[PDB]
Amino acid sequence: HTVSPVNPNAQQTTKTVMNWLAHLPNRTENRVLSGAFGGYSHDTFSMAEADRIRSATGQSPAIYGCDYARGWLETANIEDSIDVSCNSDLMSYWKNGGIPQISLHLANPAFQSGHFKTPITNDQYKKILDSSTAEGKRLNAMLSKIADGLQELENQGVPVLFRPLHEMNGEWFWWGLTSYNQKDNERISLYKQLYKKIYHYMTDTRGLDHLIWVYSPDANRDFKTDFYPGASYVDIVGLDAYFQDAYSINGYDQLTALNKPFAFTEVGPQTANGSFDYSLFINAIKQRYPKTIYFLAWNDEWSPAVNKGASALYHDSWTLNKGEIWNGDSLTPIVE
Ligand SMILES: [Zn+2]
Numbered sequence: 376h377t378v379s380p381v382n383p384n385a386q387q388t389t390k391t392v393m394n395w396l397a398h399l400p401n402r403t404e405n406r407v408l409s410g411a412f413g414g415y416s417h418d419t420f421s422m423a424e425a426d427r428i429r430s431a432t433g434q435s436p437a438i439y440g441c442d443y444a445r446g447w448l449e450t451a452n453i454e455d456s457i458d459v460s461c462n463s464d465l466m467s468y469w470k471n472g473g474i475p476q477i478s479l480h481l482a483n484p485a486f487q488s489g490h491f492k493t494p495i496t497n498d499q500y501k502k503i504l505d506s507s508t509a510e511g512k513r514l515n516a517m518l519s520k521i522a523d524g525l526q527e528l529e530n531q532g533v534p535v536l537f538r539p540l541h542e543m544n545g546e547w548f549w550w551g552l553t554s555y556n557q558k559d560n561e562r563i564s565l566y567k568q569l570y571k572k573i574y575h576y577m578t579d580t581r582g583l584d585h586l587i588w589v590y591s592p593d594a595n596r597d598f599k600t601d602f603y604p605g606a607s608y609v610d611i612v613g614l615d616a617y618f619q620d621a622y623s624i625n626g627y628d629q630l631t632a633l634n635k636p637f638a639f640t641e642v643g644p645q646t647a648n649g650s651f652d653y654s655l656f657i658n659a660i661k662q663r664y665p666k667t668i669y670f671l672a673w674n675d676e677w678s679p680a681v682n683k684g685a686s687a688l689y690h691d692s693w694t695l696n697k698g699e700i701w702n703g704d705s706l707t708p709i710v711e
Contacts, residue, residue: 376711378636381610386584389534391706392474393587393610397636399668401710404692405699407660410438410476410671411678412641417458418445419674425697427680432689435697438476438536439468440671443521446482446491454516456482456489459524469533472698476536476589476671479521483549484513494546494553500565504572518573522581529585538589538640539573540566542615544598556597563601570604591615591640592626599626603633611668613640617677619651621659631666639670643677653684657691 378397380389399406411428414420420441429435441461448456465475483490485499495503502510528535543551543566550569552562577583590609592599594616603609612630616639631637639660644651653672660667672679679685689696700706 380587381607382578382584382586384582384584385586386529386532386534388532389585389587392534395700395706395709396587396611396668398709398711399636400666405695405707407657407667407691407693408437408474408669408695408700409434409689410440410669411436412440412442412671412674413461413464414674415442415445415480416461420461420464422464424674424678424680427678428685428689431680431685434689435473437695437697437700438474438669438671439465440476440478441465442478442480443524444479444481444491444517446480447489448482449487449489450482451488452516453482453484453488453513454520457517457520457524459520459527462524462527465535466528466531466533468697469531472701474536474700475528475533476538477525478538478541481517481540481548481550484510484517485549491549492547493549495549496553497559497561497565500562500569504565504568515576518576522577522583525577525583525586526581529583532585534585534587536589536611537577537586538591540570541591541640542593542596543602544596545593546596552596552598558598558601563598566602567604571608574604574608587611589613589638589640590635592630594618594624594626600629600633606633606635609633609635611636611638611640613638615641617641617643617645619645621656622663624659624664627664627666636668637664637666638668639664641673642670643673644682648676648678648681649683651682653679653682654687655684657684657688657693661693
């Protein structure tokens with residue numbers, strides 16, 4: 376069968392990549408892409424994390440992440456929190472055998488700037504969704520700058536795993552819940568409106584046809600599927616999972632039941648680096664989470680390079696690394 380991007384007008388390369396990703400779990404090996412966060416653009420983003428991984432394992436992550444939005448910064452104009460300078464490295468990463476991933480630590484447009492983890496009321500959230508308000512104009516200014524950056528990658532036909540508004544069932548980011556594991560039906564509705572607003576702006580208003588859309592609740596909070604905006608707006612579902620016990624992560628059954636490819640969209644140890652063993656994570660994928668198509672481990676103290684088991688993680692028969700998705704200039708054969 377053919378699995379199509381939810382954007383019917385997706386570029387051919389993006390169509391090909393999405394279909395290829397969806398078929399990975401049919402294989403007997405070479406079926407989970409490795410991934411690493413590279414950092415926040417013009418703050419911590421660099422090739423240093425990829426280099427640490429290559430030093431540790433001889434291989435580079437198949438997926439490399441950048442985050443455009445430095446939402447903790449107070450700035451003269453809120454959109455100054457957006458920086459897209461990591462694009463050059465992302466485009467090179469695609470040219471050299473990997474796939475870029477972009478997330479957004481969005482500044483909070485209920486405020487003049489910054490405040491990304493300052494919670495807001497439903498009344499404030501409604502103002503943000505209203506393009507006529509001061510708050511709504513701030514959101515749109517951020518979206519426009521983000522789209523400008525994404526457009527640079529689209530010009531070169533570079534497919535992007537785009538993962539906006541993540542961990543929305545968590546109580547830390549402004550776009551998520553306001554209290555720990557507290558259901559708020561209005562907040563859920565407003566989140567879906569916000570996701571669709573971003574989807575519509577990027578896909579339709581700006582015609583961005585190189586995006587694969589990733590929905591990523593937190594593994595350690597309830598309501599993992601309640602926030603799902605719908606099958607027509609999401610390509611890949613996944614868990615952001617920070618844990619000690621790889622075998623006890625919640626949410627895999629709930630998300631795979633949505634009949635979308637599944638990934639560990641973020642992964643890392645919950646407690647201080649050094650002792651956590653990534654060998655247990657890849658084994659847990661094989662035993663508990665076999666539909667996993669990729670993992671994206673965080674950098675800094677969460678990196679496999681500063682924990683145990685990087686070699687086992689990267690050299691497992693199931694793992695696919697940078698360059699290994701290709702047979703020359705075509706992707707490796709799909710298995711049905
Ligand atoms: Zn098929």
